[PDB]
Structure formats: structure tokens, C-alpha cells
């Protein structure tokens, strides 16, 4: 209710790595311009949290970016060509690539969506198997489904999403210090205007220091932008 969410740390090493990522980015004494700009695109972070009687039980206290919406329409999109990190074993690489073998080709994967429908006063939800079933031939209509609300295709929300993704893309083109694997973009628009539209980066259990542009992430964002752009011509 307070506008936040508690996300339980994933098992080690993933949860500890995500905690350290948030701790690094939101360090009070940080004056790295790259990290200060990155804050704009993340949920606000309120630190590690645990229940008063259970210090063993670890959570991240994060901004709930859907809180300002009346009927939020939400889509989660995993970004990049590789869902596995630079230290994955042969087995883990195979595990990750088999979850969605089109990741290299498309550069993104819809993890899920929840869409408000005006005429029925109800939500339609798609699970992980929806996005994993999409191919090059069906990715445009697949993404389009998210924006079908209010007796129309919400081209206002599509255009606003492109404009917000572009700012994230620009951040990625001006930093050579972090590479992001199996991270996502969370899209929110108002289902009940341009409008209230929010796009935030989430899921940081596989973010690593780097010396290069995150090329896979850039490829994914560019392709996602291209798909959304084609939807404006519907």
C-alpha cells in the first residue's frame, strides 16, 4: 500500500549480486555521472529489508512503479541476445538458450503481460509461454496485443514507449562499464493519454563490470524500438 514492493533475494549467487548492484548504483556518496543517470531508469531503491523477527529473510525494498496508475497495463520484456552470463557453464548456456532459442535473432523476449480491457472491466494475462512461442513472423502481433485497450490500438502508449526506450538506449550508448544479462524492461500504461507511461529497467542478478558497450542489449533495444515503430503504421 505505501507505494513500494519487497522483492525476495534470489538464491546465491543471484540475490547477493542483485543486492550489490542496487547498493552500487544508489550509494549515497556516488558521483559517477553514468550511475547517477542510470537511477532515473530504475525503480527507486530503499535498501535491504528483513522482517523485524526474521533477519535471515532478505528482501530489496523497491518502488512499485504501477502504484500511480488506476488500471495499470503491464508488460515485462527481457532484453539482450544472451540470457546467460559470461561465467555460465556449458550446461547453463544450453539451459538458457533452450528456454528461448530465438534470443540471439530477436534480442528480446516477452516474459508476461497483464492488459486491462475496458468493455469487460477485466484483465487478460499472458504467462512466460506466450513470449517463448513468438517467432520473427509473430513478434509484431505478439507485442501489439499489449496495447489493445480502450476500443482501439493504443498508439499513444506505443509512441510514448518508443520515446522512453530511446532515453535508455542513449544511456547504453554512452556507458562502457556494465553489461546486463537476463535483465528486463517493465512497461506500464494507464488502461482506464500519452500518458501515464512508465518504462523501467529491472532484474539485476546478472549485471557484470565490463570494458565494452553492451552490444547485445543495444541490439535488443533497437529491435524492440523497430517493432514498436512498425506498430505505429497499423
The ranges assigned to domains in the chain are: 1-234
* Structure method: X-ray
| Cα–Cα distance, 175 to 208 (Å, whole number) | 13
Which residues lie closer than 8 Å to 28 by C-beta, 6 or more apart? none
**CA–CA dist 108, 15 (Å, integer):** 23
| Spatial distance between the Cα atoms of 118 and 134, rounded to a whole number of angstroms | 26
**25 among annotated binding-site residues:** no
Give the sheet arrangement for strand 59-63, strand by strand. Answer: 4-8, 59-63, 45-49
Is 203 annotated to bind ligand? yes
**β-bridge mates for residue 206, sequence order:** none
C-alpha cell at 110: 516477452
Closest CA to 230 of 151, 167, 136, 149: 136
Q: Is 136 annotated as a binding residue?
A: no
81 is in an annotated binding site: no
Contact 228, 161 (CB under 8 A): yes
96 in a labelled binding site: yes
Place of cell 532459442: 101
175 is in an annotated binding site: no
Beta bridge partners of 186: 76, 200
Going 12 to 133 to 217 to 69, the CA torsion angle's sign is negative
What number of other Cβ atoms are within 10 A of residue 142's Cβ?
A: 18
H, E, C per residue of the chain: CCCEEEEECCCCCHHHHHHHHHHHHCCCCCCCHHHHHHHHHCCCEEEEECCCCCCCCCEEEEECCCCCCCCEEEEEEEECCCCCCCCCCHHHHHHHHHHCCCHHHHCEEEEEEEEEECCCCEEEEECHHHHHCCCCCCHHHHHHHHHECCCCECHHHHHHHHHHHHHHHHHHHCCCCEEECCEEEEEEEECCCCCCEEEEEECCCCEEECCCCCHHHHHHHHHHHHHHHHHCCC
Q: Which three cell numbers stand for residue 224?
A: 524492440
**Does residue 167 have a known ligand-binding role?**
no
Q: How far apart are CA 58 and CA 8, in angstroms?
A: 6
Say whether the peptide bond before residue 13 is cis (omega within 30 degrees of 0).
yes
- Separation CA 202–CA 215 (nearest Å): 18
Give the torsion through C-alpha atoms of 130, 136, 137, 138, to 10 deg. Answer: 20
Resolution of the coordinates, Å:
1.8
Residue 71 counted as an annotated binding residue? no
Q: 158 among the known binding-site residues?
A: no
What's the distance, Cα to Cα, between the start and end of the chain in Å? 38
Amino acid at each position: 500500500p505505501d507505494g513500494t514492493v519487497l522483492k525476495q533475494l534470489q538464491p546465491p549467487p543471484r540475490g547477493p549480486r542483485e543486492l550489490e548492484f542496487y547498493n552500487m548504483v544508489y550509494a549515497a556518496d556516488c558521483f559517477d555521472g553514468v550511475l547517477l543517470e542510470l537511477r532515473k531508469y530504475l525503480p527507486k531503491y530503499y535498501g535491504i529489508w528483513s522482517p523485524p523477527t526474521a533477519p535471515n529473510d532478505l528482501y530489496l525494498k523497491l518502488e512499485d512503479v504501477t502504484h500511480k496508475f488506476n488500471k495499470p497495463c503491464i508488460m515485462d520484456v527481457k532484453i539482450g541476445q544472451k540470457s546467460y552470463d559470461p561465467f555460465a557453464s556449458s550446461e547453463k548456456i544450453q539451459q538458457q538458450v533452450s528456454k528461448y532459442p530465438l534470443m540471439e535473432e530477436i534480442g528480446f523476449l516477452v516474459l508476461g503481460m497483464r492488459v486491462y480491457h475496458v468493455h469487460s472491466d477485466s484483465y487478460e494475462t499472458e504467462n512466460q509461454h506466450y513470449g517463448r512461442s513468438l517467432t520473427k513472423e509473430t513478434i509484431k502481433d505478439g507485442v501489439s496485443r499489449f496495447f489493445h485497450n480502450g476500443y482501439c490500438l493504443r498508439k499513444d502508449a506505443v509512441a510514448a514507449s518508443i520515446q522512453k526506450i530511446e532515453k535508455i538506449l542513449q544511456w547504453f550508448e554512452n556507458q562502457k562499464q556494465l553489461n546486463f544479462y537476463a535483465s528486463s524492461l517493465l512497461f506500464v500504461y494507464e488502461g482506464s493519454s500519452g500518458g501515464e507511461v512508465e518504462v523501467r529497467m529491472i532484474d539485476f542478478a546478472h549485471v557484470f563490470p565490463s570494458n565494452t558497450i553492451d552490444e547485445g542489449y543495444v541490439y535488443g533495444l533497437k529491435h524492440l524500438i523497430s517493432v514498436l515503430r512498425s506498430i505505429l503504421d497499423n
